[PDB]
Write a protein that binds this ligand. Sequence first.
Ligand code: HEM
Length: 465
Amino acid sequence: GKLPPGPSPLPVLGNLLQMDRKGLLRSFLRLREKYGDVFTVYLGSRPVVVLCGTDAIREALVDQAEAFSGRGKIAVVDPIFQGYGVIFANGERWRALRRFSLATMRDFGMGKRSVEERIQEEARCLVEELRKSKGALLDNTLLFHSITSNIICSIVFGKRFDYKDPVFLRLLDLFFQSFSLISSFSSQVFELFSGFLKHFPGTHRQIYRNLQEINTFIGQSVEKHRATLDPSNPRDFIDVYLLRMEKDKSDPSSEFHHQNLILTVLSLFFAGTETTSTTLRYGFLLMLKYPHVTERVQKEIEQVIGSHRPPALDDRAKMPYTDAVIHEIQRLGDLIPFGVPHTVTKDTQFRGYVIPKNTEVFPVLSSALHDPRYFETPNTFNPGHFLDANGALKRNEGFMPFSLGKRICLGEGIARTELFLFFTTILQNFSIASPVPPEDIDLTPRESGVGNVPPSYQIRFLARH
Ligand code: HEM
């Protein structure tokens, strides 16, 4: 068969030279109009299939769920192919270890009420920090990365850190050092400091010192966990990992398992922090721009929850307006616009084309979240996109911010619970304000017109009743 159509490739560098300063997404818009909703682009010598709009993406990821279930391969864009290989973590074992972690993640005890509990507790701690600010203008970027990372910490180590715990501050600094703590100005900051960062003396020394401290912490925590381990009551991720190790007959002193544990915990930290944090940050920017929406949410909190008690996950079912607002925030927020790449597990036939085994495939989630076939005003913030005439929450096929099919976001439940409880506990306790009138606030994704980054903004949290 033939691959889906697309712009003609240059031998060996494919379509890398033919991209626009306009931006990747707008360019994907152009190719789709020119070639349709399934097209092929060449990253160097390697073809990549691009899936646009709700229907094509669901046809692949749901209708042919297994065929499209392959995990992405980022080796693809890796320049060093004058050797090929990949230096893929010390042999067959590390393949073993990564699936050990995946299993542990997939086999790690939901304890939904215990996760809910952890998030309520974090939400309380956040409210006390916000009250202290006494309505001062602030940048909420660091706080929102703090609360989301602290949930991961509580699920991994069994308890949250204090916000100014030295080890917690090193974790947050590592986020900064790895770019998982960026703002609107960050890129001009990096640019200003480029000679420092890239020429001399770089940041590897500072990153090293952070990782050593984090590594020490984790090792000590592992020991303290092992010393009190109870198979009938796994407390957290470390316990579940230890339990699987015990079962595997694994050396308690393995360096491989120790390394593997830390890399898995870093993965969890990174996955669990940035997208959720940025969603909250964007949500409050939208709440500033639409004060009547925010008022309606506060009205619903009052009706269903009241003051007097903290929001609980069970309240969401009774708060369709608030739930719609959060859906809409995620929709317009569009945190992972190109999706996470998949590969097909075998030769795949798709709308009459053939996609060779192990070809990279991007389900462009932005093109579903903005699909006019499913949302009447894709580029306008409107909670009504998720509400019917009776005011009840409406299911929308186009709503796939966590992807779909076999490998939907493993954190989708924790993420949605954080969004619901953080948004409602904050708004129950505070009103918000900024120095910019709503009609003047600009929500366009800053950073070169593309890519990401919500505009950085100032906000006041004004304590209620
Ligand atoms: C608003 C927040 C979040 C968004 C929009 C987001 C979205 C995504 C998306 C689009 C994927 C790719 C699924 C695919 O391969 O098709 C995914 C992967 C995943 N997410 Fe999230 N996510 C968020 C929150 C979280 C959180 C809180 C965690 C918690 C640790 C997390 C963990 C992961 C995991 C482990 C994967 C890999 C799943 C698989 O390959 O097996 N995510 N997520």
